[PDB]
Write an enzyme that holds these catalytic residues in place. Sequence first.
Site, PDB file in Angstrom:
ATOM      1  N   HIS A 126      45.398  37.912  36.695  1.00 39.86           N
ATOM      2  CA  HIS A 126      44.733  38.734  35.684  1.00 39.86           C
ATOM      3  C   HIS A 126      44.758  40.180  36.209  1.00 39.86           C
ATOM      4  O   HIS A 126      44.060  40.549  37.157  1.00 39.86           O
ATOM      5  CB  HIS A 126      43.302  38.286  35.429  1.00 39.86           C
ATOM      6  CG  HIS A 126      43.116  36.897  34.912  1.00 39.86           C
ATOM      7  ND1 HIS A 126      41.915  36.220  35.006  1.00 39.86           N
ATOM      8  CD2 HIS A 126      43.990  36.071  34.282  1.00 39.86           C
ATOM      9  CE1 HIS A 126      42.075  35.027  34.467  1.00 39.86           C
ATOM     10  NE2 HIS A 126      43.322  34.909  34.030  1.00 39.86           N
TER      11      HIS A 126
ATOM     12  N   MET B 279      37.095  34.502  38.764  1.00 39.04           N
ATOM     13  CA  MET B 279      35.929  34.234  37.936  1.00 39.04           C
ATOM     14  C   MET B 279      36.372  33.599  36.617  1.00 39.04           C
ATOM     15  O   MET B 279      37.464  33.893  36.109  1.00 39.04           O
ATOM     16  CB  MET B 279      35.182  35.534  37.645  1.00 39.04           C
ATOM     17  CG  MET B 279      33.884  35.321  36.869  1.00 39.04           C
ATOM     18  SD  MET B 279      33.013  36.833  36.376  1.00 39.04           S
ATOM     19  CE  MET B 279      32.880  36.522  34.598  1.00 39.04           C
TER      20      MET B 279
ATOM     21  N   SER C  58      42.756  35.491  39.822  1.00 39.50           N
ATOM     22  CA  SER C  58      42.073  36.640  39.261  1.00 39.50           C
ATOM     23  C   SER C  58      41.425  37.411  40.414  1.00 39.50           C
ATOM     24  O   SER C  58      42.162  37.798  41.349  1.00 39.50           O
ATOM     25  CB  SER C  58      41.077  36.213  38.191  1.00 39.50           C
ATOM     26  OG  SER C  58      40.586  37.330  37.458  1.00 39.50           O
ATOM     27  N   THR C  59      40.115  37.608  40.348  1.00 41.45           N
ATOM     28  CA  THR C  59      39.403  38.342  41.388  1.00 41.45           C
ATOM     29  C   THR C  59      39.683  37.825  42.795  1.00 41.45           C
ATOM     30  O   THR C  59      39.339  36.707  43.161  1.00 41.45           O
ATOM     31  CB  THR C  59      37.874  38.357  41.201  1.00 41.45           C
ATOM     32  OG1 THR C  59      37.520  38.942  39.941  1.00 41.45           O
ATOM     33  CG2 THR C  59      37.141  39.237  42.215  1.00 41.45           C
TER      34      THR C  59
ATOM     35  N   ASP D  32      39.573  30.335  32.913  1.00 47.49           N
ATOM     36  CA  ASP D  32      40.989  30.490  32.635  1.00 47.49           C
ATOM     37  C   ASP D  32      41.807  29.742  33.705  1.00 47.49           C
ATOM     38  O   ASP D  32      41.688  29.989  34.901  1.00 47.49           O
ATOM     39  CB  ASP D  32      41.373  31.962  32.645  1.00 47.49           C
ATOM     40  CG  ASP D  32      42.633  32.302  31.903  1.00 47.49           C
ATOM     41  OD1 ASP D  32      43.148  31.522  31.069  1.00 47.49           O
ATOM     42  OD2 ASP D  32      43.151  33.416  32.152  1.00 47.49           O
TER      43      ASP D  32
END
Length: 347
Positions: free
Chosen positions: A190, A283, A164-165, A286
């Site tokens: 994501h 973050m 993600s991030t 997930d």
Amino acid sequence: MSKIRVLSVDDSALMRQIMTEIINSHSDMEMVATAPDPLVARDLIKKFNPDVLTLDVEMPRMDGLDFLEKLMRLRPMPVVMVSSLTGKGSEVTLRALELGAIDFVTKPQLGIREGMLAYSEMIAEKVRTAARARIAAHKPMAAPTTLKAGPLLSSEKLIAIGASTGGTEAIRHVLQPLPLSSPAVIITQHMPPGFTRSFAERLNKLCQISVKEAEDGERVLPGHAYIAPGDKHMELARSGANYQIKIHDGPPVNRHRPSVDVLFHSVAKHAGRNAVGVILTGMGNDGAAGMLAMYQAGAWTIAQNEASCVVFGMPREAINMGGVSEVVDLSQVSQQMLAKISAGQAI
């Protein structure tokens, strides 16, 4: 209360005000100032020492790439990009990311073709993520050559990945070094729709292996990396005795679509012991549950270490569930996932 101080950079007056209105509508943040261009931004960043910088790069004169380029070079800080989904919006937005932006928010020209509240909560959470982000993980670092040799494994071998991030940069470090003889890699980053394609196309250039946006029903084969499409879930499936990609529109899991859990759970199911899993920077949780399940079906699991991560959230959670076989530095992940998938099992 509103301890987070933000400086937004937009050539548009109405845009500069919209950003202050929405930022100031949250208790944990405040707009310290706004700047119309990379020159005034430089000045007011020095003056107000803000925690978070929002960069709208769609401005004619000297744009945010060469200032952002120098901002991170000579004394970096948290920067959150603002995009225009559209074509160049992405390329420029990925450029910024490859340059250092922590993340990005989207708004097609205006808060048009989309709704204000959802936009404000997006802005809100991105600024929080950027405010706690490990800016040092973005220190300039040569991606490894590391692993670069070998012959073709059983087609049952696979590597599944979630991020993600900060993932955009992390993913490149895991994939770039891979050789054309590598097992298939299926990945869930994501990301919003459209961006996922541009992302896939940028990797495809930088890597030896092919990298593409996954598509329903297609075969899963060596020398390839498959990026899940935004606002759609991606999973591993099986037709006959061969894998295949499967795209679906099920509800968001961990309030995410594409979700890393959705993907990891399907891998545990159809590849089992013939997979390796890697949870990277991001973050939230997930990927934690879905990863434990991979570990349980027999897979060797890897989580990115804390000092490598811009955001340790995701790896952390996976680890604290006991679903991880080892924590690796980002710069060793490619060589380790490749060495893990290549030992035994075909036999």
